[PDB]
Design an enzyme around this catalytic site. Structure first.
Site, PDB file in Angstrom:
ATOM      1  N   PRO A   1     -20.484   7.043 -18.846  1.00  0.00           N
ATOM      2  CA  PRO A   1     -19.940   7.949 -19.749  1.00  0.00           C
ATOM      3  C   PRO A   1     -20.466   8.065 -21.089  1.00  0.00           C
ATOM      4  O   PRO A   1     -20.566   6.838 -21.785  1.00  0.00           O
ATOM      5  CB  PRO A   1     -18.573   7.803 -19.342  1.00  0.00           C
ATOM      6  CG  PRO A   1     -18.336   6.876 -18.278  1.00  0.00           C
ATOM      7  CD  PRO A   1     -19.529   6.055 -18.377  1.00  0.00           C
ATOM      8  N   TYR A   2     -20.221   9.035 -21.737  1.00  0.00           N
ATOM      9  CA  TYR A   2     -20.625   9.187 -23.306  1.00  0.00           C
ATOM     10  C   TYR A   2     -19.835   7.967 -24.038  1.00  0.00           C
ATOM     11  O   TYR A   2     -20.498   7.163 -24.758  1.00  0.00           O
ATOM     12  CB  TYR A   2     -19.950  10.794 -23.723  1.00  0.00           C
ATOM     13  CG  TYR A   2     -20.382  10.987 -25.247  1.00  0.00           C
ATOM     14  CD1 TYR A   2     -21.308  11.595 -25.739  1.00  0.00           C
ATOM     15  CD2 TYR A   2     -18.922  10.923 -25.903  1.00  0.00           C
ATOM     16  CE1 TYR A   2     -21.342  12.017 -27.127  1.00  0.00           C
ATOM     17  CE2 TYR A   2     -18.883  11.326 -27.302  1.00  0.00           C
ATOM     18  CZ  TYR A   2     -20.192  11.879 -27.809  1.00  0.00           C
ATOM     19  OH  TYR A   2     -20.277  12.371 -29.082  1.00  0.00           O
ATOM     20  N   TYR A   3     -18.526   8.127 -23.932  1.00  0.00           N
ATOM     21  CA  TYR A   3     -17.652   7.114 -24.920  1.00  0.00           C
ATOM     22  C   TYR A   3     -17.865   5.793 -24.319  1.00  0.00           C
ATOM     23  O   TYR A   3     -17.710   4.879 -25.023  1.00  0.00           O
ATOM     24  CB  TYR A   3     -16.384   7.682 -25.155  1.00  0.00           C
ATOM     25  CG  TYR A   3     -16.312   8.429 -26.327  1.00  0.00           C
ATOM     26  CD1 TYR A   3     -15.596   9.940 -26.373  1.00  0.00           C
ATOM     27  CD2 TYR A   3     -16.641   7.903 -27.628  1.00  0.00           C
ATOM     28  CE1 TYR A   3     -15.535  10.475 -27.475  1.00  0.00           C
ATOM     29  CE2 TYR A   3     -16.077   8.701 -28.698  1.00  0.00           C
ATOM     30  CZ  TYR A   3     -15.563   9.975 -28.492  1.00  0.00           C
ATOM     31  OH  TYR A   3     -15.570  10.722 -29.645  1.00  0.00           O
TER      32      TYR A   3
ATOM     33  N   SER B   1     -24.897  14.238 -30.299  1.00  0.00           N
ATOM     34  CA  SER B   1     -23.789  15.268 -30.167  1.00  0.00           C
ATOM     35  C   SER B   1     -23.519  15.618 -31.791  1.00  0.00           C
ATOM     36  O   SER B   1     -22.198  16.136 -31.803  1.00  0.00           O
ATOM     37  CB  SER B   1     -22.638  14.762 -29.462  1.00  0.00           C
ATOM     38  OG  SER B   1     -22.367  13.579 -29.821  1.00  0.00           O
TER      39      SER B   1
END
Ligand SMILES: [Co+3]
Ligand SMILES: [Co+3]
Ligand SMILES: [Co+3]
Ligand SMILES: [Co+3]
EC number: 3.5.5.8
Lengths: 156, 217, 120, 152, 152, 120, 217, 216, 119, 151, 119, 216
Positions: E105-107, G110
């Site tokens: 995951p991203y985080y 992002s």
């Protein structure tokens, strides 16, 4: 401990899923992309696996499902009574099903699907009669009527 | 908790009977015939061969004829009266010797001498066993716990046509004066397939994992 | 319209057996026990029971097992032609390039119909 | 012979077509990561002992001039104190990550990592490394040759 | 509609069976690496603009408490000079390698990388990190609680 | 800007060797030859040289090989702590569930730093 | 139960504080700052620009200076006093027009204008959006329900360095005489990103699936 | 020229330009590597077969035993503190009628270079590193080696600073053989453990050889 | 080995980033309006100049600020500062398949001076 | 050129897309969910609605053999060997998932034309195999092969 | 087994397909304008009623012709003939993600009577 | 020669040998297909644009309307009962200011061959077949076609025996044009629905062309 060893073996099996590879999806390539080697590989008879490299696995026994025993009997009875010979079954069951189904589905699953197949291919039943029978069978289960030796009827 | 396979099995069987392809009696008869099958007859054939050199000769040359001696007539024992449709009627017995050891497989599928041995093991049907045994027998056999001298001829028999095989292992030491029953007792299903050899005191296949069925027989 | 004869096999093999019911229908055998034969790499489109791993290899015939229609024909309902089947023994070293010389006596025995054989 | 060669090419080619449930992963949410997956993803790439694999006909491999030079460079960097061998192993066999670890050649990783230590410990800037790569390419393009790999 | 749900589940499931020529890579020799493959393997993982991808029904995702804490930690570490955001991006979106970059995951990558900078700049030994993880697990198991993730 | 000491290792090990240069720095060993020890499944994030396949398994210490910083520390430039390394022998049956009783005497020997060991 | 992520988060935070990298106060202060962030200031900037041509010119030429008018000083509003470490201090406002419409993305990660817009959407961070927007903007925007005349210039802005962007869409028809508050109310987060355009009566981002967290803030 | 050769040149020139190591250092190391081979290890085995006292030393203190064949793990390498990657803790594993060793480095390719030379390509393979520790009997059979089922096959995983060489049992038919004669049949493969010494066999078993694009 | 944890703060406090690097790049090599082609410089280890822009030609529309290149900053090397330019590319020049129907579409992104060369 | 290498790169990295690749080797029935059962027994040709990426569509020059295959298939139908629906079922479904997407459009048409001849017993599989050998020998002997190769 | 190779030509020559089946289905069960839902009938071996339509509701806009169902024709069974209907579905009823911006988009396809049930 | 060419020859010879069809039948079919093209369909559209009565006929009874342009779905094909694969139920879909059609066969490649010719390679691709029905707006945009958001885009999935051709709306700048002039801008792509007619454009949009190994 058994719990730690269990996680260790689960890990060794899981990392296999992450084995790096050059994954080339095939989306109906043009004839110019099919080499003789690929042509032979694609038109291969699926059941011919002798000699292919594979890994060691801890071989296991498996209990027989009631439906597997019934499937086996059905296939031999169909042959006994001339609907097909065993060789016709093997060809349809272990080859005609194609590469994906050949290895993606269970051994007896292919036997059963192919038994249904011979009834339709030799026109002993229309595909409509098969589809209709499946629908009715499902209703039988959903209603609580029970399904032969697979599920008893509803009580109190 | 009915699966798609159970629904389809019922569908196929009901349709076949409704169309008169085979009868309900036929299906029951085959199921009951299969339930009578097992490795005992094959084990007895091996024990008898060990106890009678003349019978052993017959086993090696004419498995079909020899099979009759243990009550399994490949032509008339099955309900068809022409042998089972899938196992046919050409059993061959492979006799191991001090210089030869056999092991059987069906790379194309799962061909097995059902009439005299019973149903095939789950692993025998596996793509894995079918891929590897013919090419790395020494390695596969070792995994099963079996090792033979390097000079010994390991022969893998691939049952790809109408012949079905059973392996007659060499009689193990420590069985002097043993009766037919005593000898037959140590000839397990695994010995008849060739992935194991008979040993005094061992009367059951080597223990291995057992995958349970959702709804067993 | 197509009508399938569901009694042919039974009437023919009852009390006799399979492949016994085909005995004598192949005529004289082309090869004999002891002969060295090479497996022809015949097209295998749609079906074959002569494993790919045996193609082009040479083995020794050890037994004329029986007569029967080739599976390539039987599997499609064509039993008019019957031929001899042979049990052939191959040296493992002749099938797998990597086989160790330490196990120089290992072999593989399997059956092949006459159509795939040619004198080596 | 020619038939056997085609047979063996076939046995190797059909492996490419082995059916599988291929689930592409595109940065899944934390809720899609089980402890099992977490451990597998954060594993140390070099720890492969016990993993199932197939039999392969082992071969010897002739040494490339650049491989011999890479090995010498890595030992010289350690000899002269730029790093200890353990720091090299950690960077070379683990930090590279799963994909490069098995997708690139053994010595390719040794070499990439040798370049890596120079940058990570700031003995050279990444810019200097990038410029140097450009210089080497121009040297080959200009016909000036490249060490013992290509004469001018 | 239970039927529609099954239809969409089906459409997503068949994608797993998309046929492909799957070539596993097990440390191939240098002779098997073309320039195209070299550039692909040594690419910087975060550079994905222009790559083909399918249409997906974009969703919003609730923020996990640990995600908010991870973000704060990363910005605080930069605020106090442990690293600059650019150092973080390079370590977090590139150094993690292809597999972790898209598998986790991203985080998850933000957090793993925060742990990484502590170790790489030697503010904490890897041993201290390993010991702290063990301590945290025991804390949870003992019923002692874990921050505002789990009350005692 | 950080400065790296490129002379420390050479000055310390020249004429002595590695791990010889760490001899005596670990103090008294916690275990001795003959002891049965179980491998603790310590977190392995980022680095470890104690294979996953050994975690949770029990083995026998057959030798105290030397003293050295754990690889987990050395690989990140931390050599201030030194500990004892042990050579441990595991019965193959205790590592691999499928190992055959036919080869009941087979074993595997490998080295593990003291931090991973606990009395069996 | 706590996940591997929560365990590691606590471990990292405690170690960092223990070693004096940042204080427990620093962490609380940062979380408080993040909690005050949102799209309201950016929406007011757009509304103010619509109502003041002079201010609009300022927004277009000097985003940082313009931002001060909505209470967001890119240098001094964050706790650092030198801008947030990750968002930097170079905001640029992209002004749509009857012949130009912008949409923003960070293909490399992002990157988002957090100080004035809040936290980035989950989909904005996706490999999918980062792969496709720069190459097939017409198709991606259509998926979001946004379509523009073929002759209109759609410009995709890829925030790959230290600049962060917010989109100033054209003022929609049907807002004659509207107050600043009324106009800001229809400038949603999605409008400021560029995947939607402001519309009278629409005061919330288009509804889409919401993936729940295991343990939400 | 390949991307690997371009990068190798770049890294080497930068390292030298920055004074990390000299052009001379690099040549010194390549020259050292070129002096390496399996002979010293084979000689150690031959000497042990002919001297029980020396064999005991080999088993207890491999580092000391190695000096006898001219390879001082500390002082022979250019560093004078052992090679950076092979270290200074050689252990010799003695086979016996009831014990047979085979070596691997599952984590990488750890090998006793100072006394044995460079590692075989297959020894470095993920395949060998994955399989040997778990299916040793099977892998050894592939190599053409089989031992009695009751014999203890011990796989040694060189995961830390110890490097190993295998001392095989002396084979039959070598009565009266000289040290040179005995050393001659102790091949590199015998020292790794994938083969056992045999009279008349003086080279590793022939295997496929993958050619390099630009060999040394 | 000691890491300076006060350098960035002492330098950017009350000023901002990239404001703190203002003037350190010297004279700009290009100006607004210039046509530039993106050099395909080696990407090993790190780069913030997307692969999809390599070899393409665009128009500089603004000199956004001065700052060390990300390729250096991401590795703790801030000794060199250069000009950053915002460049506009015609979509058709990036993607071969772009439709002539949408011939006015563009893509704007920033690139440090080192990747630029007169078109 | 640079752009050419850029596009080759964008295409190549797709090969390295990470995934959880679970090989299937005849799993037990207890490993087949209803979802998987439906996915495996699906008719291959029913792809409408499946997610896919954008591709620059192209026209394709017609091969002589494709032209002949199409004519053969319509002629077989014209003459009652089969109806078009029978062809579709055999050609776009019976071939199975792997061949369906791994082989070329017309390759399936051709394989299926051969298939109908054998399945309805107009030719034995042996006659087909023998004919294939015949065509190969015709070429090898230089006797030519239809309009594809002159003698 | 003998296959009739003249049957099809004999009944369709000079008439056409599906014209040759006209009137064989009898009275149609549904009429133009009716709202119908697609039954998710078993797909085993063959079907020409796409999975994406299962369970959706649409509007019949035309009774196109009469013909044996493909499910039967594809296996040589033409004994039964039924009505085929052209049905129009609102895209939003097929695809959950379809945008309200394109609220009028539709999909039209044909389905034999056996799959239809009053909505 | 390729495996495909070898098999095509084998199949064709066997079929003829067994009397399934003749060499003449094969030749006659190849010739018929060779004459097929989009011209007839383009003329039907042009005619509809200039004749309100005919337009109504096209929309209500495509098969009847087709006769007006020389293509009889029943009698034009060699069979005299329509082609075996295209059948005899052509439907014409008329676009309008509030409706625009686009066609596909998700199950295969069903195309109105008799009046339009052979299908484009891309029309038969799994990609087009997967995407058009779900993301028509996006797919058409890729083709360079975009319509107002309020306009009803209707995708027709030719899955049974009906085949379609799209009758696009008459474009601006064609006032006073003759039937020929109008038919000239109605390309194959316009008849499929991936493009709309435009004055001055008389050929499909140029796109990559994959060459065959052995064409003709
Ligand atoms: Co079988
Ligand atoms: Co970003
Ligand atoms: Co190593
Ligand atoms: Co179609």
């Amino acid at each position: 401990s058994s719990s730690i060893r269990e996680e260790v073996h689960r890990h060794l099996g899981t990392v296999a899923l992450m084995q790096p590879a050059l994954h080339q999806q095939t989306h109906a390539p043009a004839p110019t992309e099919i080499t003789h080697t690929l042509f032979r590989a694609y038109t291969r008879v699926p059941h011919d696996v002798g000699g292919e490299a594979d890994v060691p696995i801890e071989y296991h026994e498996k209990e027989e499902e009631i439906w597997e025993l019934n499937t086996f009997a059905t296939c031999e009875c169909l042959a006994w009574r001339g609907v097909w010979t065993a060789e016709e079954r093997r060809r349809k069951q272990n080859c005609d099903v194609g590469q994906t189904v050949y290895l993606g589905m269970p051994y007896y699953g292919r036997w059963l699907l192919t038994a249904a197949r011979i009834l339709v291919d030799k026109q002993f039943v229309t595909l409509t009669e098969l589809h209709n029978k499946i629908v009715e069978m499902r209703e039988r289960v959903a209603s609580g009527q029970g399904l032969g030796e697979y599920l008893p009827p509803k009580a109190k | 908790e009915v699966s798609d396979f159970e629904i389809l099995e019922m569908a196929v069987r009901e349709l076949a009977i409704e169309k008169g392809l085979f009868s309900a009696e036929d299906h029951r008869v085959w199921k009951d015939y299969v339930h009578t099958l097992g490795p005992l007859p094959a084990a007895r054939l091996v024990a008898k061969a060990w106890l009678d050199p003349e019978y052993k000769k017959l086993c090696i040359e004419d498995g079909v004829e020899a099979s009759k001696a243990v009550g399994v007539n490949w032509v008339t024992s099955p309900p068809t009266q022409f042998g089972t449709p899938s196992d046919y009627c050409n059993l061959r017995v492979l006799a191991d010797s001090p210089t030869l050891k056999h092991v059987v497989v069906c790379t194309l599928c799962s061909c097995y001498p059902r009439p005299i041995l019973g149903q095939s093991p789950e692993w025998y049907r596996s793509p894995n066993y079918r891929r590897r045994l013919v090419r790395w027998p020494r390695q596969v056999l070792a995994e099963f716990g079996l090792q033979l001298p390097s000079e010994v001829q390991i022969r893998v028999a691939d049952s790809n046509q109408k012949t079905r095989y059973i392996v007659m292992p060499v009689r193990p030491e420590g069985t002097d004066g043993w009766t037919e029953d005593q000898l037959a007792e140590i000839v397990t299903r695994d010995c008849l397939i060739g992935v194991a050899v008979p040993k005094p005191g061992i009367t059951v296949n080597a223990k291995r994992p057992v995958l349970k069925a959702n709804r067993p027989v | 319209k197509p009508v399938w004869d569901r009694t042919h096999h039974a009437k023919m093999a009852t009390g006799i057996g399979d492949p016994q019911c085909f005995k004598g229908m192949a005529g004289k055998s082309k090869f004999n026990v002891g002969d060295r034969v090479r497996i022809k790499d015949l097209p295998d489109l749609f079906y074959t029971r002569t494993m790919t791993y045996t193609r082009g290899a040479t083995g020794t015939i050890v037994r004329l097992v029986y007569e029967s229609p080739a599976a390539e024909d039987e599997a499609f309902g064509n039993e008019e032609n019957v031929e001899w089947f042979y049990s052939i023994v191959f040296a493992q070293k002749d099938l797998w390039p990597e086989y160790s010389d330490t196990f120089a006596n290992d072999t593989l025995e399997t059956e092949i119909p006459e159509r795939y054989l040619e004198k080596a």
